[PDB]
């Protein structure tokens, strides 16, 4: 019971950190999207920079 | 032995998961850093866009 309880406590710890890994996986994925979008914009803003800068020229 | 093993599976679970959760925290932090760098590129790419777009106006 104590070992199983330890296993359960260990799983509870694990579920908090598994959930944390998942929160971080989700944040990572959100951030990965934000990265492709932040970089998309870095590039798009530069694409637009050139479109407008070209017009500026 | 199965319960202690379960404790060890759950504890190993935590070691792998905690380390993984940290790897995910790091990948997440990396995506945060990268999206922020990309976002900052976007802040400047957009800022530069604004400067040329404003200058275009």
């Amino acid at each position: 019971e104590e070992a199983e309880k330890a296993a359960d406590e260990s799983e509870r710890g694990m579920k908090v950190i598994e959930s944390r890994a998942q929160k971080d996986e989700e944040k990572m994925e959100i951030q990965e999207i934000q990265l492709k979008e932040a970089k998309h914009i870095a590039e798009d803003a530069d694409r637009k920079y050139e479109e407008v800068a070209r017009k500026l020229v």
Side-chain angles (χ1 to χ4, degrees), chain A residues 7-39:
Chain A
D8 291 344
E9 181 62 24
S10 293
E11 288 190 359
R12 284 189 287 270
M14 187 185 78
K15 292 296 178 184
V16 172
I17 61 171
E18 186 178 0
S19 294
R20 185 171 69 83
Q22 291 167 354
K23 299 296 183 181
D24 289 340
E25 289 166 358
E26 290 169 353
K27 299 296 183 181
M28 178 190 73
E29 289 169 353
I30 291 165
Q31 289 173 341
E32 188 176 59
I33 292 166
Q34 290 169 336
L35 173 57
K36 78 181 178 70
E37 292 298 314
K39 189 71 186 298

